[PDB]
Amino acid sequence: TSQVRQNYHQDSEAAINRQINLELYASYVYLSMSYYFDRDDVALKNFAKYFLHQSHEEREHAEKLMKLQNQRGGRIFLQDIKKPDCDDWESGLNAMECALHLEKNVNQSLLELHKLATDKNDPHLCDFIETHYLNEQVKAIKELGDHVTNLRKMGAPESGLAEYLFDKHTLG
Amino acid sequence: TSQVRQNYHQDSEAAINRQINLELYASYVYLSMSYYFDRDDVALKNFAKYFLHQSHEEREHAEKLMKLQNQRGGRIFLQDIKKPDCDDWESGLNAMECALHLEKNVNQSLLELHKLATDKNDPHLCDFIETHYLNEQVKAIKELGDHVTNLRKMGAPESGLAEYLFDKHTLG
Amino acid sequence: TSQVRQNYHQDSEAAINRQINLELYASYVYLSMSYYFDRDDVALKNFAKYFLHQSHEEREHAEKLMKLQNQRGGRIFLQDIKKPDCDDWESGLNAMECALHLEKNVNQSLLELHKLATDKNDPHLCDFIETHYLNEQVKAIKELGDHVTNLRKMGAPESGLAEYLFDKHTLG
Amino acid sequence: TSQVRQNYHQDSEAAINRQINLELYASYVYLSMSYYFDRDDVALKNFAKYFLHQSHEEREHAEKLMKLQNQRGGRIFLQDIKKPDCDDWESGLNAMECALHLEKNVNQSLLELHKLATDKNDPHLCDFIETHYLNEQVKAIKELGDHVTNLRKMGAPESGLAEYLFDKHTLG
Ligand SMILES: [Mg+2]
Ligand SMILES: [Mg+2]
Ligand SMILES: [Mg+2]
Ligand SMILES: [Mg+2]
Ligand SMILES: [Mg+2]
Ligand SMILES: [Mg+2]
Ligand SMILES: [Mg+2]
Ligand SMILES: [Mg+2]
Ligand SMILES: [Mg+2]
Ligand SMILES: [Mg+2]
Ligand SMILES: [Mg+2]
Ligand SMILES: [Mg+2]
Ligand SMILES: [Mg+2]
Ligand SMILES: [Mg+2]
Ligand SMILES: [Mg+2]
Ligand SMILES: [Mg+2]
Ligand SMILES: [Mg+2]
Ligand SMILES: [Mg+2]
Ligand SMILES: [Mg+2]
Ligand SMILES: [Mg+2]
Ligand SMILES: [Mg+2]
Ligand SMILES: [Mg+2]
Ligand SMILES: [Mg+2]
Ligand SMILES: [Mg+2]
Ligand SMILES: [Mg+2]
Ligand SMILES: [Mg+2]
Ligand SMILES: [Mg+2]
Ligand SMILES: [Mg+2]
Ligand SMILES: [Mg+2]
Ligand SMILES: [Mg+2]
Ligand SMILES: [Mg+2]
Ligand SMILES: [Mg+2]
Ligand SMILES: [Mg+2]
Ligand SMILES: [Mg+2]
Ligand SMILES: [Mg+2]
């Protein structure tokens, strides 16, 4: 057993490994979305920039969980990073909707993780999740909701003008 | 009687207390409007910022009247601040129209106050109202009129694109 | 249902609306206290400044809860802001004692809110309350306790000299 | 008749001359009060400084009225400046009370002047009085009221310690 390990349940260790994979998966989804908007037949550069930034943030989320695993004396176990569900994201609106769904899925996973940490009476892990993840998810979900709303109200996805102007004014 | 009181009619004192309540009410209306635009299903951040600023200005208006009451040796009497008439403000245009109506109501109250001050030959109070309130109301009403006009001309409330672009160009 | 809503119980939503009202009420109590000390027959300018600052802090507390409501996909429901229990706060000491009682009442409401959030397994809401409210209340209550103690030891409320000197040395 | 004179009643001209004398009288009262506190057997240097400043402000008030008289084409007529009612002002509290009475008398004179200007339909003169005099009087009266209140509450005039500490904390 690790010389540093204390009050860290094997179930929590495993759940942290699963969360690491999910964060890496989210990074990959956003990477794919970003370059879709870089296609010459899509060509929305600020959508591309926005999603690339989101991708990099998810890699940071994964790295912090890997750090946590080692801090607590658990052992990192990695698995394949699955390719994103879609190759062609259809429109700015559809990509935003997919991102919203993704962030809500990630949030649900984090809430399940917190429930486990609570069940195993691991207040350090609870605080870690609350501090570094839970409000970040709430903010991300709210932002994506706001974006989806604006795109719908502007007339997306049918209006190419709507996505163009949103790209300039909201994401620019 | 207050050692400072001079040429300050009891009716004027009471009218100032009523005006304090009205200013606080206006602050509350604008606070409510602001957060309506912060809803994920409305999501117009500059409408939200604009109305929050207006809310804070109304609190300043109330505070200055409370200061005046004490300056003249009257006694502040507070009453409940009524909740705003609406919970859901419907659209950017409708909120602007409500604000216009509010500011015109507040102006009418101030004009009645000035008429009272004039009837009681209180030139200090007349000057106070003129200096700090009457032109501020005229400017506010004109600005809201301008805003309503632009939103109508742009195609609001039906055009979600109109409110979106107004949010960026006029309120941004 | 709001597109952003996740793990947010209707009871929590309602409790947040009640807390918004309480924060606004506290803002109003402190506003009233502030201007009492601005009366020509009370004339303690640093008591007035101290309570006005406290009033503005409570408005910020209310605004943050309104932001939270929208972040989580709840809907803000406002109610009348009740006037403060008192018109004449009697003395610096009595005002401090009323503020202490107010902050303890607000704290109790926040603890009930946290208990609800805990019962509904809402760790995001728990963390929000802990981070932004619970220690602020503990600090406020401690400060007001300290103030009450000093005023009593100095000879307030009978000693007008005590309140005068406290105004200069502690609140100045 | 003066080439500049327009809408300026002879009664208003005379009333302005009377007001000039009153302002000069107030300057003299405050000068006397100031040096009372400079006596070796009184020795409150900040009371002395406060009243000397007030004296200089009254001279400025007189000068502005002399300027106004010429601006409107009236002719300045000066009269003796009467010595102050008292030689020995007794205490800091008593001097403050005398100043309060003085400023209220000056205010009454200004209100009578404004009533005359109103009766003669002289809006320029009304605005002059409102702008430069009426709120200055309200502020002065409020400040002196505040000072009297604090001195009374602290235990003046019996408490030499009260006047000493007020001299340091409020006037210092
Ligand atoms: Mg262990
Ligand atoms: Mg896995
Ligand atoms: Mg992100
Ligand atoms: Mg993440
Ligand atoms: Mg596969
Ligand atoms: Mg997908
Ligand atoms: Mg946090
Ligand atoms: Mg947010
Ligand atoms: Mg444009
Ligand atoms: Mg009166
Ligand atoms: Mg009322
Ligand atoms: Mg305004
Ligand atoms: Mg107002
Ligand atoms: Mg009602
Ligand atoms: Mg309305
Ligand atoms: Mg006038
Ligand atoms: Mg004027
Ligand atoms: Mg003006
Ligand atoms: Mg204008
Ligand atoms: Mg829910
Ligand atoms: Mg309520
Ligand atoms: Mg506070
Ligand atoms: Mg609070
Ligand atoms: Mg009631
Ligand atoms: Mg109370
Ligand atoms: Mg903390
Ligand atoms: Mg503390
Ligand atoms: Mg003439
Ligand atoms: Mg004369
Ligand atoms: Mg002066
Ligand atoms: Mg003068
Ligand atoms: Mg004589
Ligand atoms: Mg005298
Ligand atoms: Mg003025
Ligand atoms: Mg004042």
Short mmCIF file of C-alpha atoms in Angstrom, two decimals, chain B:
data_model
loop_
_atom_site.label_atom_id
_atom_site.label_comp_id
_atom_site.label_asym_id
_atom_site.label_seq_id
_atom_site.Cartn_x
_atom_site.Cartn_y
_atom_site.Cartn_z
CA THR B 1 -39.30 70.02 16.88
CA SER B 2 -35.91 69.49 15.21
CA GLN B 3 -33.38 72.24 15.95
CA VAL B 4 -32.57 72.47 12.25
CA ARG B 5 -36.09 72.62 10.86
CA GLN B 6 -37.01 75.81 9.02
CA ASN B 7 -39.64 76.49 6.35
CA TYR B 8 -40.27 72.75 5.93
CA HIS B 9 -43.95 71.88 5.86
CA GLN B 10 -45.24 68.63 7.36
CA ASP B 11 -46.89 67.88 4.01
CA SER B 12 -43.54 68.20 2.25
CA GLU B 13 -41.95 65.90 4.83
CA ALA B 14 -44.62 63.27 4.15
CA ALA B 15 -44.31 63.66 0.37
CA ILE B 16 -40.55 63.13 0.63
CA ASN B 17 -41.15 59.88 2.53
CA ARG B 18 -43.53 58.74 -0.23
CA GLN B 19 -40.92 59.61 -2.84
CA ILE B 20 -38.28 57.60 -0.98
CA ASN B 21 -40.53 54.55 -1.23
CA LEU B 22 -41.12 55.14 -4.94
CA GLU B 23 -37.38 55.38 -5.65
CA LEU B 24 -36.80 52.12 -3.77
CA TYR B 25 -39.65 50.54 -5.72
CA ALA B 26 -38.05 51.66 -8.99
CA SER B 27 -34.76 50.14 -7.85
CA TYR B 28 -36.57 46.84 -7.27
CA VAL B 29 -38.32 46.88 -10.67
CA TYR B 30 -35.01 47.36 -12.43
CA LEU B 31 -33.37 44.63 -10.32
CA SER B 32 -36.11 42.20 -11.39
CA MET B 33 -35.81 43.23 -15.04
CA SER B 34 -32.04 42.80 -14.93
CA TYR B 35 -32.13 39.18 -13.80
CA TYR B 36 -34.86 38.30 -16.28
CA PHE B 37 -32.28 38.94 -19.01
CA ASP B 38 -29.81 36.73 -17.13
CA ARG B 39 -32.12 33.71 -17.52
CA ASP B 40 -30.66 30.95 -19.68
CA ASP B 41 -33.77 31.14 -21.90
CA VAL B 42 -33.46 34.90 -22.44
CA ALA B 43 -29.70 35.41 -22.28
CA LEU B 44 -29.21 39.06 -23.21
CA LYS B 45 -26.28 40.07 -21.00
CA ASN B 46 -26.20 43.75 -21.92
CA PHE B 47 -29.89 44.21 -21.21
CA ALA B 48 -29.12 42.62 -17.85
CA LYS B 49 -26.17 44.96 -17.26
CA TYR B 50 -28.15 48.04 -18.36
CA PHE B 51 -31.04 47.37 -16.01
CA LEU B 52 -28.77 46.45 -13.09
CA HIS B 53 -27.06 49.83 -13.48
CA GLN B 54 -30.45 51.55 -13.54
CA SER B 55 -31.37 49.68 -10.36
CA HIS B 56 -28.28 50.95 -8.58
CA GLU B 57 -28.97 54.52 -9.75
CA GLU B 58 -32.45 54.35 -8.18
CA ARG B 59 -30.97 53.27 -4.84
CA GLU B 60 -28.75 56.36 -5.03
CA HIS B 61 -31.84 58.48 -5.74
CA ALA B 62 -33.52 57.05 -2.63
CA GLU B 63 -30.45 57.64 -0.46
CA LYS B 64 -30.22 61.28 -1.53
CA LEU B 65 -33.85 61.82 -0.53
CA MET B 66 -33.18 60.22 2.85
CA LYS B 67 -30.24 62.60 3.25
CA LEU B 68 -32.51 65.53 2.29
CA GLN B 69 -35.13 64.51 4.86
CA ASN B 70 -32.52 64.63 7.61
CA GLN B 71 -30.93 67.83 6.25
CA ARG B 72 -34.25 69.63 6.59
CA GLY B 73 -35.08 68.16 10.01
CA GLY B 74 -37.84 65.84 8.84
CA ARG B 75 -38.04 62.24 9.99
CA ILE B 76 -37.72 59.29 7.66
CA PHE B 77 -40.68 56.91 7.67
CA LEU B 78 -40.21 53.76 5.61
CA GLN B 79 -42.83 51.43 4.18
CA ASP B 80 -42.73 48.03 2.49
CA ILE B 81 -41.12 47.99 -0.95
CA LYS B 82 -43.74 46.41 -3.20
CA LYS B 83 -42.64 43.68 -5.58
CA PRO B 84 -42.63 44.65 -9.26
CA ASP B 85 -45.86 44.29 -11.27
CA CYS B 86 -44.39 41.49 -13.41
CA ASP B 87 -42.27 38.36 -12.92
CA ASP B 88 -41.73 37.59 -16.62
CA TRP B 89 -40.95 40.68 -18.69
CA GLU B 90 -41.59 38.89 -22.00
CA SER B 91 -38.96 40.53 -24.24
CA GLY B 92 -36.33 43.26 -24.40
CA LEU B 93 -38.90 45.60 -25.98
CA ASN B 94 -41.53 44.93 -23.35
CA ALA B 95 -39.02 45.53 -20.55
CA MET B 96 -38.00 48.85 -22.12
CA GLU B 97 -41.67 49.82 -22.42
CA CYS B 98 -42.23 48.99 -18.76
CA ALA B 99 -39.18 51.04 -17.78
CA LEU B 100 -40.48 53.98 -19.83
CA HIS B 101 -43.84 53.76 -18.06
CA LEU B 102 -42.07 53.53 -14.68
CA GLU B 103 -39.89 56.57 -15.30
CA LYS B 104 -42.88 58.61 -16.46
CA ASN B 105 -44.75 57.60 -13.29
CA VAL B 106 -41.77 58.62 -11.16
CA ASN B 107 -41.56 61.91 -13.04
CA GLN B 108 -45.24 62.61 -12.38
CA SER B 109 -44.65 61.99 -8.67
CA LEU B 110 -41.69 64.40 -8.72
CA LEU B 111 -43.76 67.06 -10.49
CA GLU B 112 -46.50 66.68 -7.86
CA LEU B 113 -43.79 67.01 -5.19
CA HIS B 114 -42.50 70.18 -6.84
CA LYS B 115 -46.04 71.58 -7.03
CA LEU B 116 -46.41 70.97 -3.29
CA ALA B 117 -43.05 72.57 -2.56
CA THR B 118 -44.10 75.56 -4.67
CA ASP B 119 -47.45 75.81 -2.88
CA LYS B 120 -45.65 75.81 0.50
CA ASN B 121 -43.10 78.38 -0.73
CA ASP B 122 -40.12 76.08 -0.14
CA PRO B 123 -37.52 77.26 -2.66
CA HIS B 124 -34.79 75.08 -1.20
CA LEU B 125 -36.90 71.98 -1.85
CA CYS B 126 -37.87 73.21 -5.32
CA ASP B 127 -34.20 73.68 -6.20
CA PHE B 128 -33.34 70.26 -4.76
CA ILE B 129 -35.93 68.56 -6.97
CA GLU B 130 -34.94 70.54 -10.06
CA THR B 131 -31.22 70.02 -9.57
CA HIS B 132 -31.09 66.35 -8.69
CA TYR B 133 -34.24 64.82 -10.15
CA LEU B 134 -36.16 66.64 -12.88
CA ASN B 135 -33.56 66.67 -15.64
CA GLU B 136 -32.41 63.18 -14.71
CA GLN B 137 -35.99 62.04 -15.35
CA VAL B 138 -36.21 63.89 -18.66
CA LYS B 139 -32.94 62.29 -19.79
CA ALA B 140 -34.03 58.82 -18.64
CA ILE B 141 -37.40 59.06 -20.36
CA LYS B 142 -35.79 60.28 -23.59
CA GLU B 143 -33.24 57.45 -23.54
CA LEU B 144 -35.91 54.80 -22.96
CA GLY B 145 -38.02 56.33 -25.72
CA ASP B 146 -35.04 56.13 -28.05
CA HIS B 147 -34.49 52.49 -27.07
CA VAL B 148 -38.13 51.53 -27.60
CA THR B 149 -38.10 53.22 -31.00
CA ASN B 150 -35.00 51.38 -32.14
CA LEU B 151 -36.28 48.01 -30.96
CA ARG B 152 -39.61 48.55 -32.78
CA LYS B 153 -37.91 49.68 -35.98
CA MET B 154 -35.54 46.70 -35.88
CA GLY B 155 -38.49 44.29 -35.70
CA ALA B 156 -38.77 43.44 -32.00
CA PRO B 157 -40.18 41.59 -30.17
CA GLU B 158 -40.80 39.01 -32.91
CA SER B 159 -37.25 39.29 -34.23
CA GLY B 160 -34.92 37.59 -31.76
CA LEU B 161 -32.15 38.84 -34.06
CA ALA B 162 -33.24 42.47 -33.44
CA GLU B 163 -33.00 42.18 -29.66
CA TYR B 164 -29.70 40.32 -30.00
CA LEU B 165 -28.15 43.01 -32.16
CA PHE B 166 -29.56 45.86 -30.06
CA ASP B 167 -28.02 44.19 -27.02
CA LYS B 168 -24.60 44.31 -28.74
CA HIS B 169 -24.69 47.68 -30.49
CA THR B 170 -26.72 49.98 -28.24
CA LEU B 171 -26.27 48.42 -24.81
CA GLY B 172 -22.83 46.88 -25.32
#
